[PDB]
Amino acid sequence: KVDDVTGEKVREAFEQFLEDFSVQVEKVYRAQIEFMKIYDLNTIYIDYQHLSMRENGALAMAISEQYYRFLPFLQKGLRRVVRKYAPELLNTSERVFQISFFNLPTVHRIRDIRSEKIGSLLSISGTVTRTSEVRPELYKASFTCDMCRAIVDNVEQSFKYTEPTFCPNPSCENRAFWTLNVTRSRFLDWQKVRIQENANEIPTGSMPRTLDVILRGDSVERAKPGDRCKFTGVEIVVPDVTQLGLPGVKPSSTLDTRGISKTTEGLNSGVTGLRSLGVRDLTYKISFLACHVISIGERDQEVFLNSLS
Amino acid sequence: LVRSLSPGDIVDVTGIFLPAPYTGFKALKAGLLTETYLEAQFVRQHKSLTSDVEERVMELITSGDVYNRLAKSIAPEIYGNLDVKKALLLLLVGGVDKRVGDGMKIRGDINVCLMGDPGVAKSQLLKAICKISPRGVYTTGKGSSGVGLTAAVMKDPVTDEMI
Amino acid sequence: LRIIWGTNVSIQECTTNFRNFLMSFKYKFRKILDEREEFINNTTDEELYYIKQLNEMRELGTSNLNLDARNLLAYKQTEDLYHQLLNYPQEVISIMDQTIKDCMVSLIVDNNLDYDLDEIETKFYKVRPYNVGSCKGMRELNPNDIDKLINLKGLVLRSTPVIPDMKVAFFKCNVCDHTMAVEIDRGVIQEPARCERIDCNEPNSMSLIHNRCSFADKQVIKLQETPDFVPDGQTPHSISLCVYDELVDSCRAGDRIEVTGTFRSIPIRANSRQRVLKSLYKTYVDVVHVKKVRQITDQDLAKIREVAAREDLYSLLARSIAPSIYELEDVKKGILLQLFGGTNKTFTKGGRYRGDINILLCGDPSTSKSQILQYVHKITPRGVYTSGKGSSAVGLTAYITRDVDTKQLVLESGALVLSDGGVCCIDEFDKMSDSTRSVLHEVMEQQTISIAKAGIITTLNARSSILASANPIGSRYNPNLPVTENIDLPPPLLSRFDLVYLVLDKVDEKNDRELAKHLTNLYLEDVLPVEFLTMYISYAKEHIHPIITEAAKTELVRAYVGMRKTATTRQLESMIRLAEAHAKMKLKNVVELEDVQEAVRLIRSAIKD
DNA sequence: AAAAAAAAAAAAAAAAAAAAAAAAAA
DNA sequence: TTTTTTTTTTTTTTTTTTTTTTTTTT
Ligand SMILES: Nc1ncnc2c1ncn2[C@@H]1O[C@H](COP(=O)(O)OP(=O)(O)OP(=O)(O)O)[C@@H](O)[C@H]1O
Ligand SMILES: Nc1ncnc2c1ncn2[C@@H]1O[C@H](COP(=O)(O)OP(=O)(O)O)[C@@H](O)[C@H]1O
Numbered sequence A: 001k002v003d004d005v006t007g008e009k010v011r012e013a014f015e016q017f018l019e020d021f022s023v024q025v026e027k028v029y030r031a032q033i034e035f036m037k038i039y040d041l042n043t044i045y046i047d048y049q050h051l052s053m054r055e056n057g058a059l060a061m062a063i064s065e066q067y068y069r070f071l072p073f074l075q076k077g078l079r080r081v082v083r084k085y086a087p088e089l090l091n092t093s094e095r096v097f098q099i100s101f102f103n104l105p106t107v108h109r110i111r112d113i114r115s116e117k118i119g120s121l122l123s124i125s126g127t128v129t130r131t132s133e134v135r136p137e138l139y140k141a142s143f144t145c146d147m148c149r150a151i152v153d154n155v156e157q158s159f160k161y162t163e164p165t166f167c168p169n170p171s172c173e174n175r176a177f178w179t180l181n182v183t184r185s186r187f188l189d190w191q192k193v194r195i196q197e198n199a200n201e202i203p204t205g206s207m208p209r210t211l212d213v214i215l216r217g218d219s220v221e222r223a224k225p226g227d228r229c230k231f232t233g234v235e236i237v238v239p240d241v242t243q244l245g246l247p248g249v250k251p252s253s254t255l256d257t258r259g260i261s262k263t264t265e266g267l268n269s270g271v272t273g274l275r276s277l278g279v280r281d282l283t284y285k286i287s288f289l290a291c292h293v294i295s296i297g298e299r300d301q302e303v304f305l306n307s308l309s
Numbered sequence B: 001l002v003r004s005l006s007p008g009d010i011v012d013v014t015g016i017f018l019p020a021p022y023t024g025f026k027a028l029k030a031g032l033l034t035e036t037y038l039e040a041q042f043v044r045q046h047k048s049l050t051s052d053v054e055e056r057v058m059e060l061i062t063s064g065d066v067y068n069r070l071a072k073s074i075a076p077e078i079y080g081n082l083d084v085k086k087a088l089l090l091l092l093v094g095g096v097d098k099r100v101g102d103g104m105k106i107r108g109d110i111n112v113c114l115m116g117d118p119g120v121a122k123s124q125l126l127k128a129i130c131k132i133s134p135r136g137v138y139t140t141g142k143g144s145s146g147v148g149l150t151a152a153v154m155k156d157p158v159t160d161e162m163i
Numbered sequence C: 001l002r003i004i005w006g007t008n009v010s011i012q013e014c015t016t017n018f019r020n021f022l023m024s025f026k027y028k029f030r031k032i033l034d035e036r037e038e039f040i041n042n043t044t045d046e047e048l049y050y051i052k053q054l055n056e057m058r059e060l061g062t063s064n065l066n067l068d069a070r071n072l073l074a075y076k077q078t079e080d081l082y083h084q085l086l087n088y089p090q091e092v093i094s095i096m097d098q099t100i101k102d103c104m105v106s107l108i109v110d111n112n113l114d115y116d117l118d119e120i121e122t123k124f125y126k127v128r129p130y131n132v133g134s135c136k137g138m139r140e141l142n143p144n145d146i147d148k149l150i151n152l153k154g155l156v157l158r159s160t161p162v163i164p165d166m167k168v169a170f171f172k173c174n175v176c177d178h179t180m181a182v183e184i185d186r187g188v189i190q191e192p193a194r195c196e197r198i199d200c201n202e203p204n205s206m207s208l209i210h211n212r213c214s215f216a217d218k219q220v221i222k223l224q225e226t227p228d229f230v231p232d233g234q235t236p237h238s239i240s241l242c243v244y245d246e247l248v249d250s251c252r253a254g255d256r257i258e259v260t261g262t263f264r265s266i267p268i269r270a271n272s273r274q275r276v277l278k279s280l281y282k283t284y285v286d287v288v289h290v291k292k293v294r295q296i297t298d299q300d301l302a303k304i305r306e307v308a309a310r311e312d313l314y315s316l317l318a319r320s321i322a323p324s325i326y327e328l329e330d331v332k333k334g335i336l337l338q339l340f341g342g343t344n345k346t347f348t349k350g351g352r353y354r355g356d357i358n359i360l361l362c363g364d365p366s367t368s369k370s371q372i373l374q375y376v377h378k379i380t381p382r383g384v385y386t387s388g389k390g391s392s393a394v395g396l397t398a399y400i401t402r403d404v405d406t407k408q409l410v411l412e413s414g415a416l417v418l419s420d421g422g423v424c425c426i427d428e429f430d431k432m433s434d435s436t437r438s439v440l441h442e443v444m445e446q447q448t449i450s451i452a453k454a455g456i457i458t459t460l461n462a463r464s465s466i467l468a469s470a471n472p473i474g475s476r477y478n479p480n481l482p483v484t485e486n487i488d489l490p491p492p493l494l495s496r497f498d499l500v501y502l503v504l505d506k507v508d509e510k511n512d513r514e515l516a517k518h519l520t521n522l523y524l525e526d527v528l529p530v531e532f533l534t535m536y537i538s539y540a541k542e543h544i545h546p547i548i549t550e551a552a553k554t555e556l557v558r559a560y561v562g563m564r565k566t567a568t569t570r571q572l573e574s575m576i577r578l579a580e581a582h583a584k585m586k587l588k589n590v591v592e593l594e595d596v597q598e599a600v601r602l603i604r605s606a607i608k609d
Numbered sequence D: 001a002a003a004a005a006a007a008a009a010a011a012a013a014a015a016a017a018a019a020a021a022a023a024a025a026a
Numbered sequence E: 001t002t003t004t005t006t007t008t009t010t011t012t013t014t015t016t017t018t019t020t021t022t023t024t025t026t
């Protein structure tokens, strides 16, 4: 199978950064991993300024430009570091880990969002105006063949319900008709929040621009409506899954209650040709995926005496 | 032949009367019912500075008594209220609109209000003045809202977008 | 020799004609072309207009051109391109960019300097032609000029967010994990058949990676036909505009713009599922140039200083703000002091202390207060002029409203929030409703507005200044009755205003004749800076912060005590603000006796009325 | 080459009834 | 002062029909 060479260099560089930084010699990141081991946490925090001094930014800029393609190698290196220094954090009561970046040099507004930063690591600021429920998202799927009863596991899903194609045994011939084992599958927390532009960035006469920010994992409910929050994460693009052939008849080929814009009828450039689409046209829109959130806008004596210095 | 017809015209249009296919949705319920249309081929509408109009004004000047006659000929059915007819003439013409420097502006338009008891020919006088000037609108009470309808939303059925 | 298929355009002659045009053209040929008499040839004939712009662009590094059509027609040999561009814009523009590619090299190596030219090689250039032809409205567009450059005019209604457009697809193999990029042409993606790797070579093993592709930016604009050109009994028409690359996010909503672009028509599908199309195309335009309808230089600083060195700066800008208004110099003094405002401070322990001046004008009904308010509206940088007669009870603050275009929620600020850091003018103060009045009460007391609706709880910032104008009950303000009965305003609301002025109109022969005289002189057809005030105001408001010295202490304490020989403590904090605002004028960095004397004189002349 | 099955195609909206507020007066 | 008066504010879509035209599937 074809492998990458730059990804390997980023993976070893991240391991060296985690093992060697130690600048306060305190082993600050090893201190954090020990704190996670004792407190049973599932997320790590990496500062950009700390990384901004090793390799003269060669690693930092490489991570920033292509965060989307380098995240799998960063997690792979983190797994090896955890195994080497704290095996207890390798299994649960495996913990799906998360990496949280913060303290980026420059901040962006919502009106600086262009398609040429898709996949890059950014930080944005805005006022929250709507939050949704904490729904469970399917992370690692598990199925059973209807006839063989063979078990498949760890079937990655990107944006739609994806079942496996080839049975584990080549003796079996089966293209479909699987049964999700909802008990064995891994799930994660999911939340969608709507944000708009700040009162100062809004021009004299303007209808405010909006965006969809996705919070996942331990970052749920940390943004409340009406507050002013600074998000940081990766800028992604989300397709329309309805015309990507969803299994159920419930989608019913884009059932609608309101009338779409006639102005952008045929003006929105949709790509065709793919076999999954058929003769349909796939469309895209820009959303944000956030990994770290910050905000920028007990009468018991015994417990009280504990907190104070 | 395109652009020969405009809204508000009484015309006599000739053409071929043809059946529309009515296909697509809601065709099944009709079955054998069809739409129709007329392919147009001819138009007959029922109804400037030149020496002619240069001489018309001179003729009217030589006629004399321009003020009184102009006021009087306005709505000859109604007898009396001659001063009102003088004032409606001044309203028909417009005063000077001078744009003073540094942002100051002065209006030349006329604001005439006519009060009085009911049944004095209140509402023929007005309608009649609307005939004289092409640029004029007769707006009435709360039956329709047109005086302040400077709305920015228009749910036009053709496209369902705001105008 | 060879010609691009379909058209008659050939690159060979076009490139040579364009280089001859650029190195040859001057204002000499331009003024020979137009030759409208009274045409200046004072050294302009040899200025080499194109080469100087080319060099200044090279040294700046920006890629923006403003090639005109009349200037392109000026040269005799390149006259062919004038009629060769109107009919084939795309290919001619492609030649345009290709020639500009080496227009850089033609000038960088004339003296053989050490410019890298590598960043020039990487970057690309384009052109923005304008004034292509006679401007025609959207109401006259036939199918006879599809794919031809036109110039349109219209009102901007709305804009859409940035739209991604795929350029380079990206396919990965689910077996051998091999990555290959496939370019797309006109939207259609040619699917890879089987993995290129001969060893892997498996049928139907392709997966699309959406977030590893390459995208470009699009924007769509909506225009409306201008009300002037529409005839009677008609409804305005609409046109959609396509904007790409650097021109995205240029046209604000509600503006009126004239654009240049290529007319185009595309088909739209009849049925969503089937391949079938219907025999009626949609028409739009792809735009290439758009036109509509801080950073002060050191010379500006010098002229500001020398003007500030004037003996009497107070009276000059007293008369400049309202040239039309005759007399009423005292209210203009107060407004001039208000437009600067005392210094603002927020220390940790005590908290924020206000630095805005509030002024209320009231009196007989046919004075000129509304014109005064509309005068101060323009001078101030950021402000809003809305009457208080009606509208929503929170119309000056945030109002959570349902979005019209989308069934979503939008938080829209009001007029007090939109006048943050400036002067907000309220007209018809007496008609403002009893329920909305309380809103202003929290604005003039804490300078913040809190909204708690639809699950949103938040606070905004007002920090503005209120200048208001009111009218009494009746045709006159009789002096015998006190202020309270006539103005119909709550005593606290009137009290919290920093300065209150009474405008009186008495039948005086001298005053009446003098007023009528200059009014008629203005109607008769036969020391006021234009924009110096705005820059001086910005300089004083954004850089200058005065302080207080004991010289102000000695006068202020004894002045307040002497006024207390029914002056509330509000009076002293009003004197301090006015004195510190006067100190910001006659540019200084500290207060002295003159400022406090002027402030007390103003606040006692206010008491006299 | 000839069968059995499965969706698209909706669109639309005024006109009336009931309940709670925020301005008017014997 | 406690009575009458007044604007006004969501209320709306869950359903349909047999052709006609597409994809799978012996
Ligand atoms: N001076 C007049 N000359 C001729 N007819 C008159 C005159 N004054 C009143 N009329 C009559 O009054 C009528 C026209 O006015 P009308 O009473 O219809 O409307 P109005 O004055 O607006 O009153 P209302 O309040 O009833 O609407 C006609 O019957 C007309 O004959
Ligand atoms: N002192 C004055 N100087 C110049 N014009 C005046 C003066 N006083 C009154 N006017 C005239 O009277 C009119 C005043 O109207 P305005 O003050 O805007 O109405 P309002 O009384 O509603 O504020 C203006 O058209 C103005 O020309």
Ligand SMILES: [Mg+2]
Pocket: B122, B123
């Ligand atoms: Mg009548």
Ligand SMILES: [Zn+2]
Pocket: A145, A146, A147, A148, A149, A150, A167, A168, A169, A172, A173, A174
């Ligand atoms: Zn199987």
Ligand SMILES: [Zn+2]
Pocket: C173, C174, C175, C176, C177, C178, C195, C197, C200, C201, C202, C205
């Ligand atoms: Zn392969």
